[PDB]
């Protein structure tokens, strides 16, 4: 290309003009990778005034990302100060969000972290809810100290329902449970638990309810799992035939320490009517199949108990349908 046999020094005073091109950018990124200090200085001096515009640029963003790694702490702090008032603009941009995630990954000082929290805090929900913005917010949780990412938990505490039930907010909620302090995660789960009814039936909320259990199961320490089960068990059948509620029922059926109480509810307060409802539902069928699969593995008394209610129902029509044939497969094992 144009820059194969070119040299940083010939571009001094014209570096910004290269930051348009994909090839100019890659040239510069090369120079940053190999010089590098002198490259970082030259490039920092000629692009600092335009960081926002290079951050939200399709090729320029990758340059700033590279620049951020290679630049000194003094320089990095300047790039942060210049861009910080425009974090919303940058976070909404498909590229801006990638450049700004790198910035966060790169910060070493606590002054740098205070500038970032100060700059993001006012906009936490908006960004949590944004297709590009939510990632900047998650990076904060992945990278900062809990004391610095508190603001995210605080903002969520106040818009919990809409953030939990949001396509992207739900991913940010899950990042909170990944990195949150026990105290943080507890205060958050308390709020979520007050909303477990709504969340369970929700397209996106049901995943948050599952994730709590996922996380607790990871640690082998159970708290909110038990509190959730306690609230939803009384509706085991009702939720088993729900597009989204059934995701949670299955999640519980697949969590060894709570499997059997749930299977029991299905057996007792469901009976042949409830079970026939499952066998015959677009959703509860799979839940029914989960029930048989788990019970066969964990508890012969429950499996045989389920089997003897199910098998009388598997006759005629159902037997030849795909869903009928599915349960038939779970029957004698």
XYZ file of C-alpha atoms in Angstrom:
333
model
C 0.000 0.000 0.000
C 0.897 3.702 0.226
C 2.557 3.291 3.620
C 4.592 0.112 3.100
C 7.834 2.024 2.608
C 6.908 5.148 4.552
C 8.169 6.581 7.808
C 6.561 8.278 10.808
C 8.838 11.289 10.456
C 7.465 12.255 7.051
C 3.994 12.660 8.499
C 4.817 14.890 11.446
C 2.421 17.811 11.308
C 0.037 15.819 9.130
C -0.715 12.813 11.330
C -4.379 13.688 11.811
C -4.961 13.639 8.067
C -3.970 9.961 8.121
C -6.563 9.166 10.785
C -9.337 9.198 8.201
C -8.034 6.276 6.132
C -8.145 2.679 7.160
C -4.659 2.341 5.736
C -3.382 5.507 7.379
C -4.784 4.315 10.689
C -3.197 0.889 10.316
C 0.093 2.543 9.400
C -0.065 4.581 12.598
C -1.110 1.609 14.698
C 1.921 -0.177 13.300
C 4.218 2.658 14.314
C 2.646 2.663 17.776
C 3.322 -1.060 18.063
C 7.015 -0.759 17.235
C 8.458 2.683 18.122
C 6.623 3.237 20.345
C 7.104 6.059 22.834
C 8.070 8.556 20.123
C 5.134 7.311 18.064
C 2.770 7.679 21.042
C 3.983 11.234 21.670
C 3.738 12.393 18.078
C 0.359 10.785 17.611
C -0.930 11.954 20.992
C 0.019 15.552 20.244
C -1.628 15.592 16.806
C -4.836 13.710 17.688
C -5.619 14.748 21.272
C -7.900 17.586 20.197
C -9.927 15.222 18.071
C -10.177 12.175 20.318
C -13.993 12.179 20.383
C -14.192 12.266 16.660
C -11.598 9.611 16.170
C -13.221 7.468 18.863
C -16.544 7.417 17.067
C -14.864 6.859 13.709
C -14.960 3.528 11.921
C -11.152 3.241 11.571
C -10.029 5.957 13.964
C -11.476 4.175 16.961
C -8.955 1.331 16.528
C -6.114 3.823 16.467
C -7.203 5.478 19.710
C -7.527 1.989 21.232
C -3.959 1.292 20.209
C -2.908 4.777 21.332
C -4.477 4.214 24.737
C -2.327 1.124 25.386
C 0.915 2.742 24.321
C 0.556 6.264 25.737
C 1.853 7.305 29.212
C -0.331 7.797 32.247
C -0.007 11.561 31.906
C -1.163 11.397 28.303
C -3.888 8.876 29.035
C -5.311 11.195 31.681
C -5.510 13.994 29.122
C -7.335 11.811 26.612
C -9.736 10.876 29.406
C -10.327 14.506 30.386
C -11.023 15.638 26.827
C -13.373 12.787 25.989
C -15.169 12.537 29.353
C -17.797 15.236 28.654
C -18.811 13.297 25.545
C -19.126 9.825 26.992
C -22.811 9.517 26.076
C -22.151 10.402 22.459
C -19.214 7.994 22.395
C -21.065 5.159 24.141
C -24.012 5.289 21.730
C -21.650 4.861 18.765
C -20.755 1.334 17.606
C -17.069 2.347 17.549
C -17.068 4.879 20.365
C -18.265 2.107 22.665
C -15.266 -0.026 21.706
C -12.775 2.799 22.133
C -14.308 3.718 25.490
C -14.197 0.139 26.739
C -10.474 0.093 25.961
C -9.990 3.361 27.827
C -11.606 1.787 30.887
C -9.445 -1.331 30.516
C -6.371 0.876 30.369
C -6.822 3.171 33.353
C -4.421 2.619 36.212
C -4.968 5.618 38.542
C -7.913 6.348 40.817
C -8.185 9.900 39.548
C -8.860 8.300 36.170
C -11.588 6.155 37.707
C -13.219 9.083 39.443
C -13.332 10.987 36.154
C -14.997 7.987 34.524
C -17.620 7.349 37.221
C -18.278 11.085 37.458
C -18.773 11.168 33.686
C -20.964 8.079 33.367
C -23.000 8.257 36.564
C -25.560 10.794 35.336
C -26.402 8.505 32.402
C -26.306 4.995 33.839
C -29.824 3.822 32.937
C -29.731 5.302 29.442
C -26.466 3.499 28.698
C -27.495 0.304 30.444
C -30.485 0.294 28.095
C -28.516 1.080 24.942
C -27.390 -1.487 22.338
C -23.890 0.024 22.348
C -23.904 1.758 25.719
C -24.554 -1.295 27.862
C -21.095 -2.607 27.079
C -19.341 0.455 28.461
C -21.351 -0.027 31.634
C -20.416 -3.733 31.827
C -16.729 -2.937 31.321
C -16.928 -0.763 34.393
C -18.026 -3.772 36.419
C -15.384 -6.014 34.862
C -12.551 -3.541 35.509
C -13.201 -1.143 38.399
C -13.165 -1.640 42.143
C -16.609 -2.295 43.651
C -16.405 1.100 45.364
C -16.016 2.722 41.941
C -18.768 0.726 40.255
C -21.250 1.245 43.100
C -23.020 3.950 41.093
C -24.237 1.265 38.708
C -25.848 -0.709 41.532
C -27.336 2.516 42.876
C -28.836 3.532 39.530
C -30.207 0.033 39.025
C -31.767 -0.015 42.495
C -34.000 2.854 41.372
C -35.007 1.669 37.881
C -34.889 -2.028 38.658
C -37.992 -3.318 36.952
C -37.372 -1.646 33.573
C -33.655 -2.418 33.636
C -34.208 -6.043 34.609
C -36.861 -6.458 31.892
C -34.784 -4.787 29.191
C -33.009 -6.636 26.353
C -29.696 -5.039 27.315
C -30.376 -3.971 30.889
C -30.706 -7.638 31.636
C -27.118 -8.259 30.512
C -25.848 -5.447 32.721
C -27.799 -6.875 35.635
C -26.054 -10.208 35.083
C -22.656 -8.509 35.022
C -23.542 -6.980 38.418
C -24.053 -10.457 39.875
C -20.758 -11.533 38.316
C -18.583 -8.878 39.931
C -20.696 -7.390 42.684
C -19.689 -7.505 46.327
C -21.803 -9.884 48.442
C -23.433 -6.828 50.023
C -24.059 -5.309 46.590
C -25.434 -8.532 45.104
C -27.628 -9.080 48.149
C -29.181 -5.615 48.104
C -29.770 -6.122 44.378
C -31.282 -9.593 44.715
C -33.567 -8.312 47.462
C -35.025 -5.806 44.981
C -35.214 -8.434 42.236
C -36.877 -10.898 44.635
C -39.575 -8.356 45.373
C -40.260 -8.503 41.619
C -39.873 -12.219 40.945
C -43.486 -12.590 39.772
C -43.130 -9.999 36.974
C -39.607 -11.032 35.963
C -40.434 -14.714 35.622
C -43.047 -14.074 32.920
C -40.839 -11.545 31.173
C -38.900 -12.192 27.909
C -35.738 -10.790 29.470
C -36.487 -10.823 33.204
C -36.717 -14.593 33.268
C -33.015 -14.766 32.454
C -32.105 -12.589 35.443
C -34.127 -14.865 37.721
C -32.274 -17.865 36.291
C -28.900 -16.204 36.620
C -29.291 -15.733 40.363
C -29.670 -19.484 40.660
C -26.862 -20.157 38.199
C -24.547 -18.024 40.314
C -25.531 -19.497 43.650
C -25.125 -22.979 42.176
C -21.612 -22.048 41.066
C -20.648 -21.364 44.673
C -22.633 -24.205 46.255
C -24.047 -21.637 48.673
C -27.822 -21.218 48.454
C -29.802 -18.192 49.608
C -31.955 -16.498 46.951
C -32.407 -19.780 45.126
C -34.458 -21.017 48.070
C -36.404 -17.766 48.334
C -37.258 -17.860 44.609
C -38.337 -21.489 44.717
C -40.528 -20.686 47.705
C -42.343 -17.975 45.713
C -42.775 -19.780 42.385
C -43.348 -23.397 43.447
C -47.052 -22.734 44.219
C -47.484 -21.967 40.517
C -45.338 -24.772 39.152
C -47.908 -25.875 36.579
C -49.067 -22.390 35.659
C -45.484 -21.298 34.948
C -44.655 -24.621 33.305
C -46.981 -23.754 30.421
C -45.704 -20.206 30.055
C -43.354 -19.179 27.229
C -40.904 -17.585 29.656
C -41.961 -18.765 33.095
C -41.135 -22.304 31.983
C -37.484 -21.275 31.559
C -37.308 -20.703 35.280
C -39.172 -23.881 36.201
C -36.679 -25.867 34.076
C -33.805 -23.950 35.635
C -34.979 -25.108 39.067
C -35.643 -28.655 37.818
C -31.997 -28.645 36.714
C -30.664 -27.342 40.021
C -30.010 -30.528 41.994
C -30.809 -29.217 45.496
C -34.196 -27.845 44.459
C -35.102 -30.371 41.758
C -37.220 -32.600 43.942
C -39.462 -30.120 45.780
C -40.477 -28.797 42.343
C -41.006 -32.255 40.863
C -43.074 -32.951 43.965
C -45.297 -29.921 43.447
C -45.871 -30.971 39.852
C -46.733 -34.481 41.110
C -49.013 -33.386 43.946
C -50.753 -30.094 43.126
C -50.631 -30.867 39.404
C -51.794 -34.478 39.358
C -53.050 -36.141 36.190
C -54.773 -32.928 35.100
C -51.657 -30.778 35.493
C -49.415 -33.432 34.011
C -51.800 -33.891 31.086
C -51.630 -30.134 30.658
C -47.838 -30.368 30.453
C -47.844 -33.356 28.111
C -50.088 -31.321 25.813
C -48.521 -27.890 25.949
C -46.112 -26.278 23.489
C -43.901 -25.437 26.485
C -44.766 -27.683 29.444
C -44.017 -30.706 27.286
C -40.277 -29.941 27.492
C -40.644 -29.223 31.196
C -42.389 -32.559 31.565
C -39.519 -34.210 29.730
C -37.073 -32.469 32.012
C -39.047 -33.723 35.013
C -38.780 -37.322 33.843
C -35.112 -36.946 32.903
C -34.088 -35.459 36.246
C -36.269 -37.790 38.331
C -34.893 -40.868 36.534
C -31.403 -39.779 37.533
C -32.027 -38.517 41.055
C -35.011 -40.371 42.452
C -36.544 -43.692 41.376
C -39.573 -43.180 43.594
C -40.385 -39.906 41.847
C -39.607 -41.222 38.349
C -41.847 -44.258 38.711
C -44.462 -41.967 40.209
C -44.311 -39.608 37.223
C -44.154 -42.508 34.773
C -47.371 -44.076 36.009
C -49.385 -40.902 35.487
C -47.792 -40.130 32.131
C -47.980 -43.567 30.483
C -51.812 -43.857 30.591
C -51.928 -40.582 28.674
C -49.652 -41.697 25.860
C -52.242 -43.347 23.624
C -53.746 -42.713 20.200
C -52.961 -39.303 18.620
C -50.224 -38.049 20.953
C -48.260 -41.221 20.262
C -47.620 -40.231 16.653
C -46.910 -36.556 17.207
C -43.317 -35.339 17.686
C -44.060 -34.133 21.226
C -45.815 -37.357 22.176
C -42.849 -39.369 20.886
C -40.549 -37.194 23.001
C -42.118 -38.179 26.314
C -42.414 -41.796 25.211
C -38.630 -41.672 25.023
C -38.369 -40.734 28.681
C -40.622 -43.511 29.891
C -38.863 -46.796 30.653
C -35.143 -45.955 30.734
